[PDB]
């Protein structure tokens, strides 16, 4: 089979860029190559055909090169609407086959999180266990760091972390962080804090409660 | 314009069969060749199958890794694309799109491509049982105010296979919310989702959570309460 590879994986770029995807093809193509564009909601369409022709539709940003084994996908001007992971694919000879796939994140102005904190329900400490729940909303660049605190001592054990996929309009992160213990666990201590630490500030920002007053 | 809406995705144990169905409409479907193009999760798309129209006699062609387990075929009067999928191996889970060809290849040129796309059928095959969510709301604590802001939650837990939806005021506020991604824990699911309304509208005015586990078929509101 022809084996398509895009050998760069992620790119991060700002608005305005010009974003070049390249793709490799194992054998020559005669210049049947394609790009699809995968939204981060898994919507996907097509953007070129046969190398360099545009779909109907699609804005005249996106463009198309290349022959023989080489090829690129160029995104001059880059738009907000443009983070999406794009894929190529030749289709001269079955079966068709696709390239891996290149994710491209925009950049935008570093932002702090907004951090808010949720004790367990009712409903589940009846059931004989206790989530606590940090959410940490709205910030850039992806990386974060978020420590729990319980009774003053860091608490890794229980933890899970989940990021969303970068906001469509603003370019923005948020985070989830659950910390999940059995109701005897929870019920043995008092005060509950998850803590963030980010690039936009020296100190961390911090969201705690009490359990005895909840 | 065009919509291709794919349904019958679900659980499915090794060896076992499932049957997708894809209906079509807004194009003149019988003129088409119309595919299965599939996505395991975290990975690139492979193309599945084809299946040409009547002028050429309904030809199929299959990826390797699916010929003789998969079926491909269509009811034109119906508008409707089918895969029947036999003997599934674990490698099979992915979503599965139903996507019209490319039209006339004396105007599109004769590379194949992929004109139209459905949204997605989600397949798993695996051993581990249906096992429904337990939802638990998210509200703040007595002890602290923002006055512009308040954000509310739910958790989402423990749930096989994927996925879930949540809506909040039945879909009413939207995109103040955020979506997290679920999570394997020990065999298991786990997600969260989050919405931000005004600090004037809440509590005074309702906040709901609506979350749907189909393959479950469960459905659960919460109200959420100080
Ligand atoms: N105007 C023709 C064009 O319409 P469009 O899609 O641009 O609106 O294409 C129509 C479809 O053409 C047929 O496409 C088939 C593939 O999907 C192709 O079969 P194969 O590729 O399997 O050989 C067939 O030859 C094409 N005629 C066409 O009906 C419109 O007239």
């Known amino acids: 089979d022809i084996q398509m590879t895009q050998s760069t994986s992620s790119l991060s770029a700002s608005l305005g860029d010009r974003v070049t995807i390249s793709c490799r093809a194992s054998?020559?193509?005669?210049?049947?190559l394609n790009w699809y564009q995968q939204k981060p909601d898994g919507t996907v369409k097509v953007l070129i055909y046969?190398?360099?022709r545009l779909r109907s539709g699609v804005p005249s940003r996106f463009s198309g090169s290349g022959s023989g084994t080489d090829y690129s996908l160029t995104i001059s001007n880059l738009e907000q609407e443009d983070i999406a992971t794009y894929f190529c694919?030749?289709?001269?000879?079955?079966?068709?086959?696709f390239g891996g796939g290149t994710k491209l994140e925009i950049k935008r102005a570093d932002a702090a999180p907004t951090v808010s904190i949720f004790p367990p329900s009712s409903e589940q400490l009846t059931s004989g266990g206790a989530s606590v729940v940090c959410f940490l909303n709205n910030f850039y660049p992806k990386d974060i760091n978020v420590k729990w605190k319980i009774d003053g001592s860091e608490r890794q054990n229980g933890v899970l972390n989940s990021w969303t996929d970068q906001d469509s309009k603003d370019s923005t992160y948020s985070m989830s962080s659950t910390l999940t213990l059995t109701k005897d666990e929870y019920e043995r201590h008092n005060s509950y804090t998850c803590e963030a630490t980010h690039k936009t500030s020296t100190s961390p920002i911090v969201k705690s409660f009490n359990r005895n007053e909840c | 314009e065009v919509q291709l809406v794919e349904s019958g995705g679900g659980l499915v144990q090794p060896k076992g069969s499932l049957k997708l169905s894809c209906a079509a409409s807004?194009?003149?479907?019988?003129?088409?060749?119309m595919n299965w193009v599939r996505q395991a999760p975290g990975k690139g798309l492979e193309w599945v199958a084809r299946?040409?129209?009547?002028?050429?006699?309904?030809?199929?062609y299959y990826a390797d890794s699916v010929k003789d387990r998969f079926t491909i075929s269509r009811d034109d009067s119906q508008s409707m694309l089918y895969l029947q999928m036999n003997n599934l191996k674990t490698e099979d889970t992915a979503m599965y799109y139903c996507?019209?060809?490319?039209?006339?290849?004396?105007?599109?040129?004769?590379?194949?491509?992929?004109?139209?796309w459905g949204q997605g059928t989600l397949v798993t095959v695996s051993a581990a049982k249906t096992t429904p969510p337990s939802v638990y709301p998210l509200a703040p604590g007595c002890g602290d105010t923002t006055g512009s802001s308040v954000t509310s939650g739910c958790l989402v837990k423990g749930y096989f296979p994927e996925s879930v939806t949540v809506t909040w005021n039945s879909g009413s506020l939207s995109s103040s919310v955020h979506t997290f991604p679920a999570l394997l824990q020990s065999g298991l699911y786990t997600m969260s989702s989050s919405v931000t309304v005004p600090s004037s509208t809440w509590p005074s005015e309702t906040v709901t959570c609506s979350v749907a586990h189909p393959a479950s078929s469960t459905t659960v509101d919460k109200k959420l309460e100080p």
């Open positions: 996507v019209r060809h490319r039209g006339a290849p004396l105007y599109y040129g004769n590379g194949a491509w992929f004109a139209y």
């Open positions: 299946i040409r129209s009547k002028s050429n006699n309904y030809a199929t």
């Open positions: 046969y190398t360099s």
């Open positions: 807004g194009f003149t479907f019988n003129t088409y060749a």
């Open positions: 694919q030749q289709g001269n000879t079955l079966p068709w086959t």
């Open positions: 054998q020559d193509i005669s210049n049947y």
